Design a protein around this ligand. Structure first.
Ligand SMILES: *[C@@H]1O[C@H](CO)[C@@H](O)[C@H](O)[C@H]1NC(C)=O
Ligand SMILES: *[C@@H]1O[C@H](CO)[C@@H](O)[C@H](O)[C@H]1NC(C)=O
Ligand SMILES: *[C@@H]1O[C@H](CO)[C@@H](O)[C@H](O)[C@H]1NC(C)=O
Ligand SMILES: *[C@@H]1O[C@H](CO)[C@@H](O)[C@H](O)[C@H]1NC(C)=O
Ligand SMILES: *[C@@H]1O[C@H](CO)[C@@H](O)[C@H](O)[C@H]1NC(C)=O
Ligand SMILES: *[C@@H]1O[C@H](CO)[C@@H](O)[C@H](O)[C@H]1NC(C)=O
Ligand SMILES: *[C@@H]1O[C@H](CO)[C@@H](O)[C@H](O)[C@H]1NC(C)=O
Ligand SMILES: *[C@@H]1O[C@H](CO)[C@@H](O)[C@H](O)[C@H]1NC(C)=O
Ligand SMILES: *[C@@H]1O[C@H](CO)[C@@H](O)[C@H](O)[C@H]1NC(C)=O
Lengths: 314, 161, 161, 314, 161, 314
């Protein structure tokens, strides 16, 4: 009586501690290569920002008017998104982006800033709504009558809520010193921001910039995070974009950058710019910068695990 | 000594192929095949694994971050990628080695089990087969398979031969 | 074939349990138990290990550092934590596999050693026991244990039986 | 004769490459979970800063008067510690903290700055000693007679020692421009700091801040590290807090942040905020941010290593 | 049971040493030595490996970078160094274990092969040697080596003895 | 007949999962320790900067006159290298160094800046050539007649090429405010730099610095990277070092810092300051900061891999 094992005519070569190319009866793949070219968002509150930039949701350009108090478990940034309508940029922009991606959305609250002795309705043609407007959450503080001076003002805000408050203000840089005197008056302008963790000063600097949407003017957006019961203080005398509403983080979420469509039919926790990685394999060779709950990225495109015995045919 | 495998054994991983005067026979051994299959299944259950660790974005594809912090990030990501590529290759290779050696071990242990069933009534041939010195019929064959063949109620006859 | 273990064997890891006409007996084999114990002890000596690499503080619990550098730090720490969790799980699993297979190997090698001591004076039963064809007394038992039993000064008598 | 192996009635389930839950005779733990709720400092020169902040030991607020030239192998920061008595902060504060944690202590040396034409005894009520004082290692340079101007001064310091010198100076930001004119005079003030590795400028910026201890004034602390024989130069004309003594690193040490008591009865090289990790196991599941010579942190709370054989009872 | 090795066997890893009435003889077995050598060679081919991953400079030896980013860089590099030191030590230890067990396995399988060649014409001695009950000449020795010795054309004579 | 295995009188002890010190027949080393004390550059376009600093190749001090448009696969920095002839430094210097190390060389293009109403031939004795010169790629913009004012100028440059342009400008900080009035006139000077990704302002700050080569003056070098078809704009009124030629990255390369000689006889892809690591072993214990295609650095100096069987002699 003869006893033995099974075999097949066509085996699968695998690699071991000893050899490279050992035929086995059966083998399976461990490195994921199949990618779903969509953002699988089944069962998740998703906000596709589209033309609205993530940071704009704090300042409120026209393209972000429907994202001022969004709420989401998954935040998607698009390449066509823009944080600004009037040309400018944020200081520490990427840190604020990373803060807002896992914020779970934002909740705005009026800061209650009243003014006496200046004009508060600065607008521009680049921030277009029904006519010429500005950032929805900001206020462009100017002088009263086309020129004359800006009084040294000190405004204070106390965070009365139990979560840190996101405070964003802006320093205006006109295209010339003559335009700065036209808007706020002559003399050296100074904006001072102080709190418990924060201490910092800012001086405007007019000058000619390349024209973006028309201007040739810029706006520096800055931000701090007030702690509960901590008070922030602004001491300004011109070239100041004042915050009208503060932001509060809703909870928790995840932010991704993608250019593929949203699909509520598939579910996935691993995302990259090209889509969603849905797999049970421990490794993947699709995108090393994938985020979420992903298999570990490896450089090998295939690593066959032997699910069968050694194949020794006749 | 089992110089090759049986491509016609489509019913299981390990089987018997007897040849007495009554006829032919090839029948898989379910309790060893199920053992090796269970162990491979366990390997697949341990390796097919899902992580509950969420990793967030620290780069930016649309607006590149600061060049120095970007080089530190890329440096770290490349290092971790090297580590995980090494771990994947070594894991696959080791698991494959242990799988092959495991199947071979199961085969050998089955062989020595059948050998210990036939105490002096049979002798090893040297190529994975057993020589019976008494024509064992098919009832005796089924008794050999399900481990019920009597080790002494066929002895004397085979010892004479 | 050793379908279970001996819960009453409290004196060692591997032991003998004989049953001739003189009486009973169960005595541990110190030189195999000490081998397996020595190997497990070596595993514990290699794994119980102290690092001389000092790691300093790069975070700050009382005053949080910059948000971006803090996210890079947290990202790196989480990656290293994933690596070390994987290494720990795989290490434990592999070491356990090799430990079990090691103990089983020691048992089998002891079995075949005792088998090679009894050349034709005994025959394998099929369940880890040996059948002696001559009533071996307790002096012969102690000679079997300490590997002094004569392989030919009991032969002819057992070969007749 | 029958030979076999031992067994027990109650085994310990472990995990292998194949199964999860294999009973073995004996098993031991590899992931440490027991924590000593104390800072084990047996045999180490320990400095518990308490109410004194780590950075304050360089400037010398009243709470750091007994930490101006400390020496230690282990430095402990407390939550009640404060780096300042007059409200203010350091620039690059965390880098300086990381420098001071492994410094092994500090050694002060008088820089030998003499003045002629200004006042040098500026004090305040927040830095309280026998009366109204200031930072022990600093000097608040003011004007002579309650207002009048500040002469353009240039002071130089050459590091005559073989180790890098820690230089710390301060820029004063008053609550208003009128107070800045009262202390140092009108006009734009400028502080220039130069050396071999350093080059940087500083301009004061008065304005209203939230009141912390009374003021409503701030002080920016800055620092550079002179190399041996390298010379640093300050060119100032007001709003300048001058260094009186420089710092030198003693040797080597370790810095931790904790809130548990110090214990000279137990010894340990792995510390976290909750205490000391004393273990020979290769892994730990207590604190991922533990520092010192620690077992690697893992997310698993337990990983049983089989110290015995397979357990197959009757 | 092979209580030591043969220092005089300079021709191969595994060999035969016979002693009949014709004379002496020690000749290496090329087909097992070449198997173990091939497997060790494969291990060396998998471990002697070159990476195509280029890593750039993120530090600066001539002008030290910012202290905080330098501490993050040093922290990450130290962590990766710990990981690679662990991986190197564990890799070397595991590979050595598998190499030793592999050589021992090759020896044992050769032993049982020669045993299965001599079916009842020889008996195990207990120390890795085989007792022949008929004086086998050197032609019979060379036939034993190249696996051509007839298992039944020497049987009856040895069974009588 | 007796069958066995081979043995030797002197084995090699190795370490396993179980023991430490198991004699085997043969063993080989896995941790590389042999170092070639040279920079093996056989088959690579190599540029040894020598006394020229890497950043200087963009600005062009006298020591970098032969490195203004270099091209290389391997860039070597030396300890005697210097980025400047007039005392000063770059902002974000290490990021620019890392950019230039993998640039593959640089290609200069005239930016075409013409001037009317100022002087453009500022020189100094520290930048010595045939006489007193300046940076080869820069232009020291001054006033016409020894003092008088500096007109508010706005110069623009559009990147007409398909690769990002490296733009470097300089802000001059004289030793005193009187020297700043002598070179550019009185009043607050302001330099504004704007583009699509960039927005930033700069204010000069005169004052006394330690004398380096004679001065006691400093020059801050700044840089941005224009995208294709993007336009950069400078708005300056004094204390401005203008760029005359922009830089473009040639391709790809690698940068190392070393102090050993160059050898075109040996080939290697792993470099460190002490030489080249040429090995096939998977690990090395030479330099943890080695760059290129290296074996992984480990702390163990030796890890013996058993190439033979267990050695059990008589
Ligand atoms: C072969 O492996 C694959 C892996 O996906 C598995 O699905 C399949 O059932 C296996 N076949 C057999 C006969 O084991
Ligand atoms: C915040 O201030 C309010 C004052 O109404 C006080 O009741 C509350 O306890 C404070 N909470 C914290 C966390 O400071
Ligand atoms: C990091 O790598 C990405 C590609 O993975 C590349 O696009 C990016 O430019 C790199 N970062 C830097 C600073 O070069
Ligand atoms: C990093 O993680 C810690 C907890 O481990 C958390 O407190 C901290 O906020 C995190 N850092 C950032 C920048 O969020
Ligand atoms: C069981 O393992 C523990 C591990 O700490 C050890 O201390 C103990 O001695 C072991 N017992 C036996 C009988 O091996
Ligand atoms: C520092 O300067 C002194 C001048 O007295 C000189 O003797 C010494 O060699 C110098 N050392 C260094 C490291 O520059
Ligand atoms: C990082 O380590 C190197 C030595 O490997 C040391 O020279 C350097 O000073 C360290 N970095 C910091 C910021 O201390
Ligand atoms: C022993 O190992 C070394 C490793 O470099 C190898 O070169 C040599 O050929 C080996 N010798 C034998 C006899 O296997
Ligand atoms: C750049 O501008 C030129 C205008 O001559 C245009 O032809 C070209 O398509 C543009 N390319 C890009 C990438 O903007």
């Amino acid at each position: 009586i003869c006893l033995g094992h099974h075999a097949v005519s066509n085996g699968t070569k695998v690699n071991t501690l000893t050899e490279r190319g050992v035929e086995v009866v059966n083998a399976t793949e461990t490195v994921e290569r199949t990618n779903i070219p969509r953002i699988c968002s089944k069962g998740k509150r998703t906000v596709d920002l589209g033309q609205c930039g993530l940071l704009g949701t704090i300042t409120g350009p026209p393209q972000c008017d429907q994202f001022l108090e969004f709420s989401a478990d998954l935040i998607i940034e698009r390449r066509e998104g823009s944080d600004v309508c009037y040309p400018g940029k944020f200081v520490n922009e990427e840190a604020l982006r990373q803060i807002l991606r896992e914020s779970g959305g934002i909740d705005k609250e009026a800061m209650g800033f009243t003014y006496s002795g200046i004009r508060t309705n600065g607008a521009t043609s680049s921030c277009r709504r029904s006519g010429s407007s500005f950032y929805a959450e900001m206020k462009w503080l100017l002088s009263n009558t086309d020129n004359a001076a800006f009084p040294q003002m000190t405004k204070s805000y106390k965070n009365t809520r139990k979560s840190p408050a996101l405070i964003v203000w802006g320093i205006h840089h006109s295209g010339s010193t003559a335009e700065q005197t036209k808007l706020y008056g002559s003399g050296n302008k100074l904006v001072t921001v102080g709190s418990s963790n924060y201490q910092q000063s800012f001086v405007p600097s007019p000058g000619a910039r390349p024209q973006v949407n028309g201007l040739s003017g810029r706006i520096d957006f800055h931000w701090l995070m007030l702690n509960p019961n901590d008070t922030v203080t602004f001491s300004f005398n011109g070239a100041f974009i004042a915050p009208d509403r503060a932001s509060f983080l809703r909870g928790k979420s995840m932010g991704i950058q993608s250019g593929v469509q949203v699909d509520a039919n598939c579910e996935g926790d691993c995302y990259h710019s090209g889509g969603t990685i849905i797999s049970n394999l421990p490794f993947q060779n699709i995108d090393s910068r994938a985020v979420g709950k992903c298999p570990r990225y490896v450089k090998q495109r295939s690593l066959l695990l032997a699910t069968g015995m050694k194949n020794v045919p006749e | 000594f089992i110089e090759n495998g049986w491509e016609g054994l489509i019913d299981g991983w390990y089987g018997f192929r007897h040849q007495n005067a009554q006829g032919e026979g090839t029948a898989a051994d379910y309790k060893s095949t199920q053992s090796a299959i269970d162990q491979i299944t366990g390997k697949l259950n341990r390796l097919i694994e899902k992580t509950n660790q969420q990793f967030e974005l620290i780069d930016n594809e649309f607006n590149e971050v600061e060049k120095q912090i970007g080089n530190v990030i890329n440096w770290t990501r490349d290092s971790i990628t090297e580590v995980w590529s090494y771990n994947a290759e070594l894991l696959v290779a080791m698991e494959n080695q242990h799988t092959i050696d495991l199947a071979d071990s199961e085969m050998d242990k089955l062989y020595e089990r059948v050998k210990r069933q036939l105490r002096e009534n049979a002798e090893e041939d040297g190529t994975g087969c057993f020589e019976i010195f008494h024509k064992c019929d098919d009832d005796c064959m089924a008794s050999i398979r399900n481990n019920t063949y009597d080790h002494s109620k066929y002895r004397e006859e085979a010892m004479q031969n």
